[PDB]
Amino acid sequence: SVPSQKTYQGSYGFRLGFLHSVACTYSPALNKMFCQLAKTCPVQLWVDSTPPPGTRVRAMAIYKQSQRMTEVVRRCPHHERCSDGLAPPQHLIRVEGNLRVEYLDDRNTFRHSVVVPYEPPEVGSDCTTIHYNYMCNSSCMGGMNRSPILTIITLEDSSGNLLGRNSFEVRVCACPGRDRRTEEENLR
Ligand SMILES: [Zn+2]
Known part of the structure; x- marks a missing residue:
């Protein structure tokens, strides 16, 4: 199967925002994050009303191209062998700066995902920020090997039911800023 990427703002009006970290930069035109390997990628959760406690936030990668859409995105054999003792070595996406990160593997599809409890916005902010690391x-040959991926962020209840969904393309690269410019120029 292929995980849905259909934007679903849902009853809480769930949207994503993005911040400069260049460790991490987001193109609204491309709906695409460009980021450096292992660096901080701040992703903002915006809601119109507050989800209940017990609400969870999942991140999962998938291949964008139809020829690989059913394939599990995971780290290349090299990087697998290179943790914080939290993230399983195969998992492409980690969360940093959170004591409650769950690393999950689907029973049927073998897809990886990383989940944290939803927290309402901190002081000074209208949104909740999660710091991902790719x-x-x-x-990397023998992993993504140049195939684009999407990260899907799902807001879920405690049983795994869908409350909201949004997604963004990702390129993990040496110079995010330069690569963003190159891809945005190919637009005009
Ligand atoms: Zn790799």
Whole structure:
């Protein structure tokens, strides 16, 4: 199967925002994050009303291209062998700066995902920020090998039921800023 990427703002009005970290930069035009391997990628959760406690936030990668859409995205054999003792070595996406990160493997599809409890916004902020880290380069042969991926962020209840969904393309690369410019120029 292929995980849905259909935007679903849902009853809480769930949207994503993005911040400069260049460790991490987001193109609204491309709906695409460009980021460096292992660096901080701040992703903002915006809601119109507050989800209940017990609400959870999952991140999962999938291949964008139809020829690989059913394939599990995971770290290349090299980077697998390179943890914090939290993230399983195979998992492409980690969360940093959170004591309650769950690393999950689907029973049926073998897809990886990383889940944290939903927290309402901190002081000074209208949104909740999660700091992801991507642990393998888009160009790694024997992994992504240049195939684009999407990260899907799902808001869920405690039983795993869908409350909201949004998604963004990701390229993990040496110079996010330069690569963003190159891809945005190919637009005009
Ligand atoms: Zn790699």
